[PDB]
Design a protein around this ligand. Structure first.
Ligand SMILES: *[C@@H]1O[C@H](CO)[C@@H](O[C@@H]2O[C@H](CO)[C@@H](O[C@@H]3O[C@H](CO)[C@@H](O)[C@H](O)[C@@H]3O)[C@H](O)[C@H]2NC(C)=O)[C@H](O)[C@H]1NC(C)=O
Ligand SMILES: *[C@@H]1O[C@H](CO)[C@@H](O[C@@H]2O[C@H](CO)[C@@H](O[C@@H]3O[C@H](CO)[C@@H](O)[C@H](O)[C@@H]3O)[C@H](O)[C@H]2NC(C)=O)[C@H](O)[C@H]1NC(C)=O
Lengths: 258, 949
């Protein structure tokens, strides 16, 4: 411990920067909520979505269903003579994704270029305070980080532990990343780093990019799935005991009628 | 930035030397007061205020001394050196009226000679040559020789308004010759020969009175000789019966004549010195003598004239007076009080209005010299100003009648500074209270908890008192001398060669305390050191001062306090021969103090703080302390060491031939120096270890023979531990003043080349290899290796009077070198520029890492000028003190004046930036909250509207 600092630089740099980043994050979250706009949904697309949900629910929950009705559903969906998915065809948009290009694009897109706006804020903050020493980090650091860490102090003998305001605010950004969700909730959009990146639950889950292709894919998926009546096994309950109905029947006396 | 902060935390105090020839003329007398001091500087003070109007400094090694100083109505004439160059100055403005060169003689006396109306010529009489020059312009036409000059001493030249120049020649024991010449052209009229076996001296003694009357006293037969140069034939011995005949046994009698230069005639009144202190005014008419006002004590007397009336000021030791052997004391309340009274010269009247009474503070000082400036005012009032001179070095002015007798006092003993130090302040009341409250020896958990609760309650009470003070508001520095967060105000002690201790502050610059020593003769060795600091409570701060003489060989040690001034009641005695050397042991003992030991000429160690544990620790150290002594005339470099208890033994010896080389200066390593980085980064990534030696001395030797080409100058690097020279560097064409400064591991010494008129700068650096040694314990018994030595050469177009390095507590900032110039401006340059690792050809990795191509051309930039306006006429030395923050060093330059500032090594990295607008920051801080509260309701209403619609 050395480099005795003033008590006026801690009350005019640390607290201001902390409040600045806190309120910047909160303002960003509130503005993100405000700017959110609804997307128009057409009735045909809605019906397509509901049919997709129906077929997916049939795929998921198909064990607890009569075999005759299950085959009737599957025929109605398939129906080689007419076919609902076969005849009903909407407009088709020419595509562009390709196998190798999209396989690579999965990584090329990513979220690589989402740090620059925070770098702009850090640059402005460092521009305001040219020669300053905010705090020291207990973690030992290597001298090859000193140019990025100090960036404005002409000292070669000094250690890299003493950080500037730029890295101070940079670490302040991710320090409250998990703290923002504490006051807001699980779905938090106050991340200062990802400013332009849209983070939301997502309006209109269903995205039928190619209605016909999705129709055919579900048509073959419903042909692949088998039928196994999970109701046919009723003998397990046959030889058992009934004591839970004695269970809250004891605790159903205690409540009277209002 | 410097323009904005003109005088925020800096100050300069201008001083001048001891007053030697000061005049108090100028009948108009607005504020003018001329003073020519004994350090080849002529200054001009102000009677009203006291500041310096115009001052001039020529020389000060051995030449240019002022010998005589005459004063006309508006023009002042003075002679410098010893009779070679004479220049005349003015008083309305500052500058040179005219200059004149003299011949090769010995200046004895000068005077003014008026032809018939006023002074037209000045007469200068040398040992054999006699000359006369003009006063308005400069022209030498009158120059001639005397009849006998070999066995003839000419002094006390008297001139008359008639137009005849007289000259008096008295040999030590034989005869006396009075000669006279005309004023129009050089023509010897006649010569008077008088035999006087008891006339021995004539330089300061016999005077001229009445109208060409030579009067001389004689204590042998206790008589008076009166002779006439103008007329009569021989002298006329006069016995001393009418007055009290009391001549001192071992004392030569002195006369105090007076003759106004403007008036052609003279007066017939003069004072006679008798014994230590016995003056008496007497008048000689033709043959009868009238004595009156038989002054009993009359410690000092002075003459004055304003018009046709003459005044004599008498200084007496009166206030209940009790006279001692030679000093005078007053036993009422203040002691050492003197009075000044005015007396008439024609008659013996005493003015009832003129009565000056003043007393001094320090004991021992006595008045030495005094001038008088009378002036007529109103119709029946006489006003005069007296300037009494203090015994050692001090000036003081008195007023006729006012609230305070002392008007202005200037400290003239602060010019020559030998040794100087800075000490801190004791403590702060709240800080001391906290320190005492934390102090726990042995307590339980309950005790610590109770103490913490009490401290919290005290803090709450203090906070309540503070808040009350704020609510109310909304509706002597010596006593306090408190510290602050960053200790920048420190108490500096200055020691004069005269023997006066001065304590001045660093912030304001006012004289806090000033003490006087019993007796100090010229060229005395002084050494100040601080043993006990002020951070502790249990015992007061302790500061020791060693002083030794050259002639007799007396050594004395004083123990005083640098905070208050009063000395402590502890002082060891000194016997045997004078103290040779002293060393400060870092180990502490007794209470919180350091132990000091001294070496006698009998080769014995004397310990100052005699204490059983002190001696136990010293004995336990035993073979760990070494002592090296250096001689110039002897040229013998010695090494002794302690064995067991207290005894010397010779360990390492060096001898140097005095005829070939000569010892000049020896510098070492500072005790308070800490190095942060112990290695250096190299080209790729490799580390390079340095060679730090805490015990290493540097010797600078020069050549006794001085020639245009043959010049020997070198530097020796010797370890004080074991006799072993590391590196010995030698030049071949350098001479003159050489300055050497020593630092962490780099030596900087400057010289001057005769073959080419230039100053070359050599930088020496010591470097180790790529592998480190033990690196846990450093000792000079081991380490059998030779460090690499790097030398480089540069050009500096200056003289470099002084040189110093900025030293910091931890040593993390840059290392700036402060260099003084003859002009007075102090320039600070980085050490990085003068680096030995300067490649000749620009190298890839060299330019890539951090390097500027080598070029021997160092220019003096005006931007890097610490002294913007305030300048130092003579830069004797500069002292740099480390502050407490990180990057702040207090620089004090001493010499003819005093000046203090703060030097910034690398701008600032510890204090808040000055240009920091809080309005913008506060506006942004409030606007963020305002916008958040604005957008909250917008989001709520948006959600509600979306849900409902
Ligand atoms: C570097 O220098 C240090 C200091 O000189 C060396 O450490 C010191 O080594 C000596 C000799 O081994 C140790 O003395 C020991 O004393 C005990 C009794 O106290 C004795 O029984 C041992 O036989 C030995 O003589 C000394 O304690 C030790 N000091 C410390 C602080 O450890 C070190 O060895 C040097 N390293 C190299 C590579 O030269
Ligand atoms: C070197 O010192 C001289 C003084 O001997 C400086 O000249 C004086 O400088 C001061 C300020 O440093 C001037 O004072 C100013 O007065 C005006 C009103 O007249 C006021 O409005 C300003 O705020 C300031 O106080 C002063 O006038 C000036 N005198 C003259 C005759 O110029 C000189 O500027 C110094 N050299 C520098 C700074 O380079």
């Amino acid at each position: 411990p050395e480099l005795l600092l003033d008590s006026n630089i801690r009350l005019w740099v640390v607290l201001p920067i902390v409040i600045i980043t806190f309120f910047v994050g909160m303002i960003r979250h509130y503005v993100s909520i405000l700017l959110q706009s609804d997307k128009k949904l057409t009735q045909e697309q809605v019906s397509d979505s509901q049919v997709l949900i129906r077929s997916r629910v049939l795929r998921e929950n198909g064990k607890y269903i009569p075999k005759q009705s299950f085959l009737t559903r599957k025929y109605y969906f398939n129906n080689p003579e007419d076919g609902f998915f076969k005849k009903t065809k909407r407009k088709v948009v020419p595509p562009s994704p390709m196998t190798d290009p999209t396989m690579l694009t999965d990584m090329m897109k990513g979220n690589v270029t989402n740090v620059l706006p925070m770098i702009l804020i850090g640059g402005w903050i460092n521009m305001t305070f040219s020669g300053f020493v905010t705090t020291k980090v207990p973690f030992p650091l290597t001298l090859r980080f000193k140019p990025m860490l100090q960036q404005g102090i002409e000292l070669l003998t000094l250690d890299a532990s003493w950080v500037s305001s730029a890295s101070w605010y940079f670490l302040n950004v991710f320090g409250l990343r998990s703290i923002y969700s504490l006051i807001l909730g699980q779905d938090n959009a106050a991340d200062q780093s990802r400013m332009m990146q849209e983070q939301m639950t997502g309006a209109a889950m269903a995205m039928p990019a190619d209605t016909n292709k999705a129709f055919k894919t579900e048509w073959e998926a419903l042909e692949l799935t088998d039928h196994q009546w999970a109701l046919d096994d009723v003998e397990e309950e046959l030889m058992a005991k009934d004591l839970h109905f004695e269970g809250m029947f004891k605790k159903e006396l205690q409540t009277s009628i209002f | 930035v410097y323009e904005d902060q003109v005088g925020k935390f800096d100050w300069r105090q201008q001083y001048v030397g001891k007053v030697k020839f000061a005049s108090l003329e100028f009948s108009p007398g607005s504020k003018k007061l001329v003073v020519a001091t004994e350090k080849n500087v002529i200054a001009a003070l102000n009677s009203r205020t006291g500041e310096i109007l115009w001052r001039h400094v020529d020389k000060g090694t051995a030449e240019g001394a002022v010998d005589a100083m005459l004063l006309h109505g508006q023009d002042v004439i003075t002679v410098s050196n010893g009779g070679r160059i004479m220049r005349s100055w003015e008083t309305n403005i500052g500058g040179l009226n005219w200059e004149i060169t003299l011949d090769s003689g010995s200046f004895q006396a000068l005077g003014l000679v008026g032809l018939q109306e006023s002074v037209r010529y000045i007469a200068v009489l040398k040992k054999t040559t006699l000359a006369l020059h003009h006063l308005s312009s400069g022209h030498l036409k009158w120059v001639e020789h005397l009849p006998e000059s070999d066995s003839i001493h000419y002094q006390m030249v008297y001139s008359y308004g008639s137009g005849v120049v007289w000259a008096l020649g008295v040999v030590p024991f034989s005869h006396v010759n009075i000669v006279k010449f005309n004023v129009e052209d050089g023509e010897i009229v006649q010569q008077v020969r008088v035999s006087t076996p008891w006339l021995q001296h004539l330089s300061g003694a016999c005077g001229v009175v009445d109208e060409a009357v030579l009067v001389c006293p004689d204590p042998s037969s206790r008589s008076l000789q009166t002779l006439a140069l103008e007329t009569e034939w021989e002298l006329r011995q006069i016995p001393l019966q009418s007055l009290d005949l009391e001549f001192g046994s071992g004392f030569q009698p002195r006369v105090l004549p007076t003759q106004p230069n403007p008036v052609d005639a003279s007066r017939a009144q003069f004072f006679l010195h008798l014994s230590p202190s016995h003056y008496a005014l007497l008048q000689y008419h033709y043959g009868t003598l009238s004595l009156l006002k038989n002054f009993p004590q009359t410690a000092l007397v002075s003459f004055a004239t304003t018009g046709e009336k003459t005044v004599a000021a008498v200084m007496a030791c009166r206030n209940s007076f009790s006279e001692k052997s030679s000093s005078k004391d007053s036993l009422a309340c203040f002691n050492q009080t003197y009075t000044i009274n005015l007396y008439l010269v024609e008659t013996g009247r005493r003015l009832l209005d003129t009565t000056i009474t003043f007393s001094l503070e320090q004991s021992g000082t006595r008045p030495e010299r005094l001038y008088i400036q009378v002036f007529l005012k109103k119709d029946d009032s006489v006003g005069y100003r007296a300037l009494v001179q203090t015994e050692d070095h001090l000036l003081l002015f008195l007023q006729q009648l006012a609230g305070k007798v002392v008007l202005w006092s200037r400290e003239e003993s602060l010019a020559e500074v030998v040794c100087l130090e800075m000490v801190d302040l004791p403590l702060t009341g709240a800080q001391a209270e906290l320190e005492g409250e934390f102090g726990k020896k042995a307590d339980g958990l309950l005790g610590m908890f109770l103490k913490r609760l009490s401290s919290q309650l005290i803090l709450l009470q203090a906070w309540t008192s503070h808040l009350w003070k704020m609510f109310y508001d909304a509706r002597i520095n010596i006593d306090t001398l408190a510290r602050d967060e960053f200790n920048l105000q420190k108490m500096m002690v200055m020691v004069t060669a005269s023997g006066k201790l001065f304590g001045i502050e660093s912030s304001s610059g006012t004289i806090l305390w000033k003490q006087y020593l019993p007796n100090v003769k010229p060229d005395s060795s002084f050494k100040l050191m601080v043993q006990r600091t002020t951070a502790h409570f249990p015992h007061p701060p302790q500061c020791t001062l060693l002083v030794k003489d050259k002639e007799s060989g007396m050594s004395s040690l004083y123990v005083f306090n640098p905070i208050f001034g009063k000395w402590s009641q502890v002082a060891p005695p000194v016997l045997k021969r004078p103290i040779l050397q002293s060393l400060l042991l870092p180990v502490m003992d007794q209470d919180y103090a350091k132990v000091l030991l001294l070496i006698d000429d009998e080769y014995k160690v004397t310990a100052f703080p005699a204490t059983r544990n002190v001696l136990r620790q010293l004995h336990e150290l035993a073979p760990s302390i070494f002592f090296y002594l250096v001689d110039a005339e002897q040229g013998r470099l010695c090494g002794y060491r302690l064995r067991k208890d207290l005894t010397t033994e010779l360990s390492w010896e060096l001898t140097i031939p005095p005829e070939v080389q000569r010892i000049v200066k020896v510098k070492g390593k500072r005790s308070s120096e800490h190095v942060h980085s112990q290695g250096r980064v190299m080209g790729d990534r490799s580390v390079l270890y340095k060679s730090l030696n805490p015990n290493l001395l540097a010797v600078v030797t020069e050549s006794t023979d001085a020639h245009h080409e043959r010049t020997f100058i070198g530097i020796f690097l010797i370890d004080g531990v074991t006799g072993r020279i590391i590196h010995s560097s030698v030049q071949k064409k350098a001479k003159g003043p050489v300055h050497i400064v020593h630092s962490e591991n780099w030596v900087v010494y400057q010289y001057w080349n005769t073959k080419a008129r230039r100053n070359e700068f050599t930088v020496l650096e010591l470097y180790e290899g790529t592998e480190q040694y033990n690196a846990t314990a450093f000792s000079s018994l081991d380490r059998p290796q030779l460090p690499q030595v790097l030398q480089q050469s540069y050009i500096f177009p200056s003289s470099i009077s002084a040189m110093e390095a900025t030293i910091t507590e931890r040593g993390i900032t840059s290392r700036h070198l402060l260099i003084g110039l003859p002009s007075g401006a102090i320039l600070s340059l980085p050490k990085a520029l003068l680096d030995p690792r300067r490649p000749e050809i620009p190298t890839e990795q060299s330019r890539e890492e951090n390097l500027i191509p080598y070029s021997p051309d160092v220019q003096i930039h005006a931007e890097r000028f610490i002294n913007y306006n305030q300048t130092v006429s003579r830069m004797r030395g500069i002292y740099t003190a480390p502050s407490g923050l990180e990057s702040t060093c207090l620089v004090v330059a001493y010499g003819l004046d005093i000046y203090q500032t703060r030097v910034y090594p690398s701008k600032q990295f510890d204090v808040l930036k000055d240009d920091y607008d809080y309005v913008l920051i506060s506006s942004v801080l409030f606007g963020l909250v305002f916008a958040t509260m604005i957008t909250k309701r917008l989001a709520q209403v948006k959600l509600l509207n979306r849900a409902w619609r």
